[PDB]
Amino acid sequence: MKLYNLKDHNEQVSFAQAVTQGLGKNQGLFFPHDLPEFSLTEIDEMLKLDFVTRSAKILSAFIGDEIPQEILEERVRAAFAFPAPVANVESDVGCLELFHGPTLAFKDFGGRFMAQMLTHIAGDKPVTILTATSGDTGAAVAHAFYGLPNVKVVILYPRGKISPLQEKLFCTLGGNIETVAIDGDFDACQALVKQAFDDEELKVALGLNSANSINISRLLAQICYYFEAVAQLPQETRNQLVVSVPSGNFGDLTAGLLAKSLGLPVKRFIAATNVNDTVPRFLHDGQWSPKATQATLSNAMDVSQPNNWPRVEELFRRKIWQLKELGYAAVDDETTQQTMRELKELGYTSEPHAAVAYRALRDQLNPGEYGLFLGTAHPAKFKESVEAILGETLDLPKELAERADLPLLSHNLPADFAALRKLMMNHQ
Ligand SMILES: O=C(O)C(=O)CCCP(=O)(O)O
């Protein structure tokens, strides 16, 4: 496979280099040099294969000769140790549940997949994985790389800006895990991570790399659950599919488009965000003006500067698609709560993030079309809110319960790269 820096089309790297390097020069994201296209027949055939084998093929389509599809099947079978079932919410709406993994969030798929690739590509090479999180990614990465003798992870997250349970899920591990509560929002956290890649001294010293969607391995793996979703739907709807994706940093939606660019039939995509509507407002007047981040019920989506947006623009550009074809909507918390109330009424328990997607989908799903909204995380990860918003008690899954009472081990640091750099050089 070949990749290029969105900031420098001449700076190119293979899949192996992209996976171990993470970021390109000048903090630029890597983009697939070639956009493979399966045929209608192949697509039709892939959908009949089991989840694991299908995912392997999709991935091989990009990776190419670098890694034999056979080996790729083994690594994927190890990573995707859980399903991605579609739950019928309404007669014309389905919810792609992506929280059946070890951390109850879709970050599990790409998180574990990357772990597999890195260990396969780099083996036991000493590596420091610096990742920024707004709630879920941190947990998926912390668990995916826990115990790996050659690996040491450092997660940055906005202090007090994520849910209690989300924090407990990855800030009470210790050992191989190191967590940092930054005095700022997610954006500042991601900026600090990216900034670390301009520090040649630091990169080489710690063998820097990132598990955020920044890493091509993260992006690609997420393309797989879209196919799995369609494969569960009846042929009848296969040509009238509308997918709503609760977006924050937009890595999920990006993977959705890539799936379509591969040949997966998707009538229309909807980018559902919360009050942090930098994208929605952009798609409306073409003016890019991010507002200061605002903490909401869907904290994992409190992103004002989606780092993956450039990857979406490049895909539309190269695929020759018109952005006006992209559905979008900004949902506030009041609407979120009431939307959660509705879903419960319909007989489906959901949470803030998924509610935002459903709201946009429900308000844009035309007759004759089947709608899908991604359940990006288990509602229990936001027990407090869900209980008070739904007015009903909620039991805690084993994955959360076994760490709800454990002590936090997070360090506190201001939004200063100098402070972070020192702490990292103190916890080698
Ligand atoms: O951190 C989280 O839980 C996010 O959903 C957003 C940004 C991280 P990503 O780049 O891995 O998607």
Side-chain angles (χ1 to χ4, degrees), residues 1-253 255-286 288-321 323-397 399-415 417-428:
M1 172 177 215
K2 293 235 303 177
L3 298 298
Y4 63 73
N5 192 318
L6 292 177
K7 291 184 172 59
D8 189 310
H9 279 283
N10 284 296
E11 171 182 356
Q12 314 180 311
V13 299
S14 61
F15 178 69
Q17 298 180 299
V19 172
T20 60
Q21 198 178 308
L23 272 178
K25 295 184 177 60
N26 299 53
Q27 306 182 189
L29 297 172
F30 285 139
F31 192 87
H33 185 294
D34 306 310
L35 298 175
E37 264 260 56
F38 285 107
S39 69
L40 21 61
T41 299
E42 302 175 309
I43 295 164
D44 187 6
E45 293 173 351
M46 301 188 292
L47 300 175
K48 299 180 183 179
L49 299 172
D50 59 6
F51 186 40
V52 176
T53 304
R54 188 195 311 113
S55 299
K57 295 190 176 300
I58 301 173
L59 291 170
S60 180
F62 291 88
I63 302 177
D65 292 302
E66 308 196 23
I67 306 177
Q69 174 171 164
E70 309 75 61
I71 290 65
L72 218 52
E73 270 189 56
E74 296 175 57
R75 314 304 301 199
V76 170
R77 184 177 300 296
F80 292 5
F82 39 80
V86 177
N88 301 63
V89 178
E90 290 185 294
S91 64
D92 62 311
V93 175
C95 178
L96 178 59
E97 285 171 35
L98 307 175
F99 50 70
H100 289 65
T103 66
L104 288 54
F106 73 103
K107 300 293 167 33
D108 275 329
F109 294 85
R112 295 172 64 69
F113 177 63
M114 183 178 113
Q116 288 300 314
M117 291 302 94
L118 192 60
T119 64
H120 176 74
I121 301 174
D124 285 302
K125 182 189 186 65
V127 56
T128 296
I129 301 172
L130 181 60
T131 306
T133 185
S134 63
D136 302 309
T137 297
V141 176
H143 281 64
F145 294 89
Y146 180 76
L148 290 297
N150 69 299
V151 182
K152 298 194 73 65
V153 306
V154 178
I155 308 302
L156 305 180
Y157 69 92
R159 192 167 70 180
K161 272 57 183 296
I162 61 176
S163 81
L165 292 182
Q166 286 184 302
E167 188 178 14
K168 283 296 176 66
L169 187 54
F170 75 90
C171 291
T172 70
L173 302 172
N176 183 187
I177 317 301
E178 203 64 63
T179 61
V180 186
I182 299 296
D183 180 33
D185 51 44
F186 173 69
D187 294 334
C189 287
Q190 194 170 189
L192 289 171
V193 177
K194 294 174 58 179
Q195 197 182 319
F197 289 73
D198 283 316
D199 194 305
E200 193 62 57
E201 316 84 300
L202 186 61
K203 291 186 301 180
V204 178
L206 311 182
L208 232 175
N209 188 12
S210 184
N212 287 90
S213 63
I214 290 176
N215 195 294
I216 186 59
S217 63
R218 268 292 305 292
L219 188 61
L220 298 188
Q222 297 175 180
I223 295 177
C224 302
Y225 46 68
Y226 282 87
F227 280 70
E228 175 57 35
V230 173
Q232 299 181 63
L233 304 181
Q235 288 281 53
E236 315 184 9
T237 62
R238 191 159 300 178
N239 191 57
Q240 288 292 309
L241 181 62
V242 181
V243 185
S244 186
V245 184
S247 306
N249 194 49
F250 285 71
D252 201 357
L253 179 59
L257 288 321
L258 284 172
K260 182 177 184 176
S261 64
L262 288 181
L264 186 65
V266 179
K267 184 175 186 176
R268 182 169 72 279
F269 278 99
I270 298 178
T273 69
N274 46 49
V275 290
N276 297 298
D277 57 0
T278 306
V279 173
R281 286 184 295 98
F282 179 67
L283 270 40
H284 184 295
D285 71 308
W288 183 267
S289 60
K291 309 174 300 178
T293 305
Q294 181 172 175
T296 69
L297 291 177
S298 49
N299 57 276
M301 287 166 71
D302 295 336
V303 184
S304 300
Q305 309 202 64
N307 196 61
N308 288 301
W309 189 240
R311 284 178 169 167
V312 180
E313 299 182 305
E314 186 71 320
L315 188 61
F316 269 66
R317 202 270 297 187
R318 295 187 56 189
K319 262 296 180 179
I320 313 175
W321 292 335
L323 285 173
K324 82 180 197 303
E325 296 295 65
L326 213 199
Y328 60 76
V331 185
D332 80 293
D333 286 356
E334 187 185 303
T335 299
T336 299
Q337 289 173 289
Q338 279 286 56
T339 294
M340 282 174 65
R341 308 270 174 57
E342 290 177 49
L343 294 173
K344 173 187 176 181
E345 229 69 298
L346 299 179
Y348 190 65
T349 301
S350 182
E351 49 72 53
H353 304 284
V356 178
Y358 175 76
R359 183 66 278 146
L361 181 62
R362 186 64 284 175
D363 298 321
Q364 293 178 52
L365 192 62
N366 298 172
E369 313 180 311
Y370 184 72
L372 279 180
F373 69 93
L374 310 194
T376 54
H378 194 304
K381 301 194 68 177
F382 315 91
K383 179 176 174 297
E384 304 178 310
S385 303
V386 179
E387 294 183 307
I389 301 174
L390 296 188
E392 60 174 299
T393 306
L394 190 61
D395 291 306
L396 201 63
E399 294 85 338
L400 268 51
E402 69 184 9
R403 290 187 175 294
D405 302 307
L406 287 56
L408 308 67
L409 306 170
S410 301
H411 295 290
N412 283 174
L413 245 58
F417 183 73
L420 175 63
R421 192 184 188 301
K422 174 170 292 183
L423 186 162
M424 293 192 80
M425 298 307 281
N426 286 174
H427 299 66
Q428 294 179 56

